[PDB]
Amino acid sequence: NASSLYGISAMDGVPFTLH
Amino acid sequence: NKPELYEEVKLYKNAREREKYDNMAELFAVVKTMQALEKAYIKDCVSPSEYTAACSRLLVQYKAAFRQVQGSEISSIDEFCRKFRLDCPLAMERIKEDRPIT
Amino acid sequence: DIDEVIIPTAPLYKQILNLYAEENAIEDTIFYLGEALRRGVIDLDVFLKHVRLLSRKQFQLRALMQKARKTAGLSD
Amino acid sequence: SSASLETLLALLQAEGAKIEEDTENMAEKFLDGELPLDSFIDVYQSKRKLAHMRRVKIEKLQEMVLK
C-alpha cells in the first residue's frame, strides 16, 4: 500500500528507533 | 552508507516544474470540490438553485483547469485521477455530461 | 516529550511520517466540513472555499509523498 | 529515565487516547455550532496531525514489544 488515506499500512516499511 | 535518506525531497526544482504542480494542484482541488458538492446534494443539504449555480461554475473552472494540465504526460482526466489516486465518481459523471445533476 | 521516545531513523523517513499524518489530518478536516454543511452550521459557499483550499494542500502533500516514497525505495 | 517498554507504551497509548478524545470533542462542538469555523480548521487540522503521528508510533512500539 502506498496511499496515506488507505491506513497505517502505508507506513509498513518505515523504520523507527528508540530513544 | 546511504546518502539520500538524510536530505528532504522537494516537489519541484525549477520554474516550469512549479508551474506544472501549481496547475495540477488546482485541477485536483476542483475535482474534489465538485465531488463534495455532488455528495452534499445527495444528502439533500443544498437547494437545487444554490447547487446548480455552484456546479455550473465548478464545471467551467474544471474545463479550464484541465486544459491547463493536459499535455504530453497527462492526456485525460482518468489518467490524472489515476496518477494521483483521486477517486471521485460523482465529479467524473458531472464532467462526462458537462452539466449539473439537475 | 513522549512524542520523542520512538522516532523514524533518518530525515527522509521523518518527512514521510509528517506527510502521512498531514494528509490524513486534512481528510479528517474535509470530512467534518461536509458534516457541518449537512447540519447547517456552515453555508455552501464557505464550505466550497475551504474544501478547495484544503484539497489543494492535500495534492501537494500527495505528490510529494510519491517522490519521497520512491526516493526511499518504498512501494509506490 | 528507566521506564519499561510496556510502561512507555502505556504512556504513548494514553497520549494518543487524549488527543483523539480532544479532537473528537472539538468536532462535535463544531457540528453543534458551538465552535467558529476558522478557529476549528487550523487547530483541528494541527491536532489531527499529532493524532496520526501517535497512531503510527504506537503501532511501531507495539510491534517492538512483539505483541
Side-chain angles (χ1 to χ4, degrees), chain A residues 2-19, chain B residues 3-15 17-102, chain C residues 3 5-76, chain D residues 1-65:
Chain A
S3 154
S4 309
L5 296 197
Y6 310 165
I8 56 76
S9 88
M11 297 296 87
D12 274 0
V14 189
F16 274 70
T17 172
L18 260 168
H19 196 91
Chain B
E4 73 277 45
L5 299 177
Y6 297 87
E7 310 226 340
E8 289 205 351
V9 307
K10 274 184 56 104
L11 192 60
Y12 57 74
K13 66 159 134 181
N14 54 59
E17 265 177 23
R18 181 182 57 202
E19 177 59 38
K20 182 193 63 169
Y21 286 120
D22 186 43
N23 302 315
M24 291 183 163
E26 216 51 46
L27 180 54
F28 182 104
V30 163
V31 165
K32 221 169 165 126
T33 296
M34 202 176 304
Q35 174 72 17
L37 183 51
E38 289 298 295
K39 285 195 52 170
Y41 196 68
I42 298 185
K43 279 171 180 127
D44 216 358
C45 55
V46 55
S47 81
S49 87
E50 249 201 331
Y51 157 81
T52 302
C55 179
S56 325
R57 170 190 279 105
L58 283 162
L59 280 167
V60 156
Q61 287 166 343
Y62 164 76
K63 276 187 299 209
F66 174 75
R67 183 185 303 281
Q68 180 61 29
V69 170
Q70 172 172 50
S72 58
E73 65 177 348
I74 294 276
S75 290
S76 82
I77 193 62
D78 302 331
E79 175 163 60
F80 173 91
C81 285
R82 164 80 180 244
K83 177 151 193 14
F84 298 107
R85 285 174 191 118
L86 179 73
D87 200 346
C88 300
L90 308 172
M92 292 300 106
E93 188 55 33
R94 295 299 99 234
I95 291 152
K96 217 200 182 189
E97 308 286 280
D98 191 41
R99 65 167 168 187
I101 204 173
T102 59
Chain C
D3 285 287
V5 314
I6 172 161
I7 65 166
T9 64
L12 181 66
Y13 297 138
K14 190 167 190 295
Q15 187 180 13
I16 286 176
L17 170 58
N18 282 271
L19 296 167
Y20 169 89
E22 279 186 70
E23 193 186 329
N24 274 288
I26 289 176
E27 195 67 14
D28 293 335
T29 306
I30 291 163
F31 177 86
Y32 282 104
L33 290 171
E35 276 264 48
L37 184 73
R38 183 196 57 127
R39 306 274 290 270
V41 161
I42 61 169
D43 62 32
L44 185 59
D45 264 311
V46 164
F47 170 79
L48 301 161
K49 175 170 146 259
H50 287 95
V51 163
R52 184 97 161 246
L53 291 184
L54 288 163
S55 304
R56 185 180 163 86
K57 181 54 141 223
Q58 198 180 58
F59 166 88
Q60 282 159 349
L61 304 168
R62 192 172 302 179
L64 251 197
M65 173 70 93
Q66 287 176 355
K67 291 198 177 194
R69 286 178 73 86
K70 179 153 265 205
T71 302
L74 293 157
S75 96
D76 227 343
Chain D
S1 322
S2 88
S4 173
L5 278 199
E6 211 65 46
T7 290
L8 290 169
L9 173 63
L11 174 46
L12 188 59
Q13 293 200 102
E15 271 290 83
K18 256 172 257 287
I19 193 56
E20 296 285 346
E21 281 306 285
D22 183 16
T23 60
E24 180 213 33
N25 273 357
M26 215 172 325
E28 242 304 347
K29 269 202 47 179
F30 159 75
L31 295 188
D32 283 346
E34 300 177 9
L35 168 73
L37 166 71
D38 309 288
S39 148
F40 172 79
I41 277 189
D42 293 301
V43 172
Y44 180 84
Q45 200 172 341
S46 149
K47 289 203 196 168
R48 286 315 285 169
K49 182 188 163 143
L50 175 64
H52 286 288
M53 315 271 285
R54 287 179 179 163
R55 279 183 198 191
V56 176
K57 294 173 192 208
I58 286 158
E59 188 193 54
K60 299 293 187 184
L61 182 59
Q62 263 157 355
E63 89 190 26
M64 271 181 193
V65 191

